[PDB]
Amino acid sequence: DLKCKWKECPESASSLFDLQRHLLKDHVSQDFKHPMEPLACNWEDCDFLGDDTASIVNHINAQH
């Protein structure tokens, strides 16, 4: 049972995996066309930053 902690998000998850896939796919489509532009957490209070979307999903599940 994963709960999206996004302020602008009114949707919840059924499993820890659900938010990861929901946040990764829904909150970050990812253009995959960036030469050198690392990804950063998109939380209001969080200042987490990662090299790739996968690095975030790992952080989101642990920190979010």
Residue 28 contacts Zn ion per CB under 5 A: no
The total of other beta-carbon atoms located within 10 Å of residue 60's CB is 25
Number of residues that bind Zn ion (CB under 5 A): 8
- The least distance separating Zn ion from the CB of residue 11, rounded to whole angstroms, comes to 5
Would the annotation count 34 as a binding residue? no
Burial 24-38 (b: 16+ CB within 10 A, else e): beebeeeeeeeeeee
Q: Which residues bind Zn ion (CB under 5 A)?
A: 4, 6, 9, 41, 43, 46, 48, 63
Q: Which residues sit in the known binding site?
A: 4, 9, 22, 27, 41, 46, 59, 64
